């Protein structure tokens, strides 16, 4: 009853679908679908601006009625080449991502069950902990670490 990669796929597809030019009055940039669930290496990357969604630890809690609170940590990384200035561009991008992550509904991820059937599902809430900038890096290439802890509840089990 784990959906880590599923949650990451939901976040990445939300970023993609909600970054096109269909909302120029609500968002700043347009990644043109340059969003992925994994990156081989900062050096490996070629196109900018590029946003990486990572996977972290997955803490869990147990509740009396067989419920299950489980908090998933989703560090998000962004990059950009200094077309005009790294700081302002990263601020634009981070504000856009914060708007993508705070507005709208809930994280809709698809869980593929063992039977082979896929059901729509929804996370509970998504709260960002802190946004950090790794300054001092290569001047043309910036970085902004934005940390999120997605709170999701799996299909009910563990009755006994």
């Amino acid at each position: 009853m784990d959906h880590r990669t599923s949650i990451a796929q939901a976040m990445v597809d939300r970023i993609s679908k909600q970054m096109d030019g269909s909302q120029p009055d609500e968002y700043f940039n347009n990644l043109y679908g340059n969003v992925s669930r994994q990156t081989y290496k900062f050096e490996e990357i070629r196109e900018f601006p590029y946003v990486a969604v990572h996977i972290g630890t997955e803490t869990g809690q147990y509740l009396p009625s067989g419920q299950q609170w489980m908090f998933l940590e989703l560090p998000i990384l962004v990059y950009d080449k200094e077309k005009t200035d790294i700081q302002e561009q990263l601020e634009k991008l981070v504000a856009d991502i914060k708007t993508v992550i705070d507005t709208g509904g809930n994280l809709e991820y698809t869980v593929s069950k063992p039977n082979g059937s896929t059901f729509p599902c929804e996370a509970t809430d998504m709260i960002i902990t802190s946004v950090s900038t790794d300054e001092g890096l290569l001047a043309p290439y910036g970085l902004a670490e934005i940390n999120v802890t997605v709170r999701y509840q799996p299909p009910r089990r563990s009755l006994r």
Binding site: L63, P64, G66, C121, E122, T124, D125, Q153, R160
Partner: protein, 464 residues
């Protein structure tokens, strides 16, 4: 041999003791703040005499047994039920028990009656010496224990805590009787996987909790961002108990106390007009004996997109005098108690739950009490024949058109406010007379109390 772990406790609620089915019985997901028990009274008799070598000793007698107690917290979870395609919540039996004392009837118009648009609990029809009787069946690990007859006593809603909105129930029971055999198949009766899947995508976040508050005396709408608050529904239930001395007895009956939809609010100080500053100044300066405030606390906020939300409506809610609070940032707390139009009316307030609450839906619920029934939004006045002037001794039966076209109360009131040049009636037949050399305006007020205004200045003069 085994041990029982709180993680393996399931709390059921049933209105009867036999023939348990998915309708007369139900499971409610609880939280770690689950506690129950049944303490006992005791009397000790001792003696005091002056004789040398006194009689130091005592004996204890078990006299009676206090009514059981219990309390658990369940998340508010509106969702649509595929069987009936109507909004409901998992613990709707509990809401019904807290509300009324008649047999549960979802389709009705009082108490825990749901609607296709939303599930609402209405506190009317709660005048009963004993609210609906529940029998809590507690399954833990494998042992069975149930409470004979309990009536909900308190339902606390705390929003300040950042976590998802929760409700703390509480009550009392006659006798916690352990059970040696299972009453019914738990898996069949308990909520199945699919319902859980449907529910989990409908949690309510306190991160978005907008409040509406308006002083119906001044008809001024304040804009207040909360920092914390709560509201509790208390029945002040008291349990009668016999007083036989020879044998140990049990509380047999109950007497519901006085309804109390008490609540509280708190916010930072905001200088912007119609903010917390303005409310503070109004309430302190005016210093009235009684107040009439329409308070609406909207958990989960509202949005143009359909999203979940739980709603509290307390029409004509009494408000106490705000008390400034001093900390790193200044804040003021307002305590309010919902009072009815009449003592026995029982219209203290009502609630709304649904996963698909829309701004229009929420407003119509506030001003009508039901999501499904709409309310008037914008009003303009259309004159008979579209005439912007009238001569003396002429009648203008000016008509009106409301919006939306689906408003339930198409009827509005008529009033002449500015100037003295014409007289109108309920029909809308505006009439003028001689010696009317001033322009007049006709005002309308919606019969539904929505709060829509329509203006038109007609230049009625001496004519040609």
């Amino acid at each position: 041999m085994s041990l029982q772990l709180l993680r393996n406790t399931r709390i059921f609620v049933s209105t009867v003791k036999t023939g348990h089915n998915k309708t007369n019985t139900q499971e409610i997901l609880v939280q770690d703040d689950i506690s129950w028990g049944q303490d006992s009274n005791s009397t000790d008799i001792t003696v005091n005499e002056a004789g040398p070598r006194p009689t130091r000793g005592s004996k204890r007698f078990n006299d009676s047994l206090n009514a059981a107690e219990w309390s658990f917290s369940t998340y508010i979870l509106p969702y649509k039920d595929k069987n009936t395609s109507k909004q409901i919540v998992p613990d709707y039996m509990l809401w019904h028990a807290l509300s009324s004392g008649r047999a549960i009837n979802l389709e009705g118009t009082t108490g825990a009656h749901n609607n296709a648009t939303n599930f609402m609990v209405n506190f009317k029809d709660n005048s009963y010496h004993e609210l609906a009787m529940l029998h809590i069946y507690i399954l833990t690990d494998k042992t069975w224990s149930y409470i004979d007859s309990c009536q909900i006593n308190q339902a606390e809603v705390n929003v300040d805590i950042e976590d998802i909105g929760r409700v703390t129930w509480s009550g009392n029971g006659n006798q916690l009787i352990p059970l040696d055999e299972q009453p019914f198949d738990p898996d069949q009766i308990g909520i199945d996987d699919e319902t859980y899947m449907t529910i989990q995508g409908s949690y309510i976040k306190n991160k978005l909790t907008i409040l509406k508050i308006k002083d119906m005396d001044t008809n001024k709408s304040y804009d207040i961002p909360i920092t914390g608050g709560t509201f509790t529904i208390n029945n002040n239930i008291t349990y009668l108990t016999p007083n036989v001395m020879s044998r140990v007895t049990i509380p047999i009956g109950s007497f519901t106390g006085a309804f109390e939809l008490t609540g509280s609010l708190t916010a930072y100080l905001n200088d912007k007009s119609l903010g917390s500053m303005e409310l503070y100044k109004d309430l302190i300066k005016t210093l009235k004996v009684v107040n009439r405030f329409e308070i609406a606390l909207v958990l989960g906020g509202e949005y143009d997109d359909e999203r979940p939300a739980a709603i509290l409506v307390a029409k004509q809610a009494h408000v106490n005098i705000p008390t400034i609070e001093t900390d790193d940032v200044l804040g003021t707390s307002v305590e309010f108690k919902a009072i009815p139009s009449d003592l026995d009316a029982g219209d203290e307030g009502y609630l709304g739950f649904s996963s698909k609450y829309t701004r229009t839906t929420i407003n119509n619920l506030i001003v009508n009490g039901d999501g499904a029934t709409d309310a008037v939004t914008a009003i303009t006045v259309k004159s008979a024949g579209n005439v912007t002037t009238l001569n003396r001794s002429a009648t203008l039966q000016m008509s009106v058109e409301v919006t939306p076209s689906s408003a339930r109360n198409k009827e509005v009131t008529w009033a002449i406010t500015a100037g003295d040049a014409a007289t109108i009636n309920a029909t809308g037949l505006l009439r003028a007379d001689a010696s009317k050399t001033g322009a007049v305006t006709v005002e309308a007020t919606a019969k539904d109390g929505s709060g829509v205004k329509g203006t038109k200045v007609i230049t009625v003069t001496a004519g040609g």
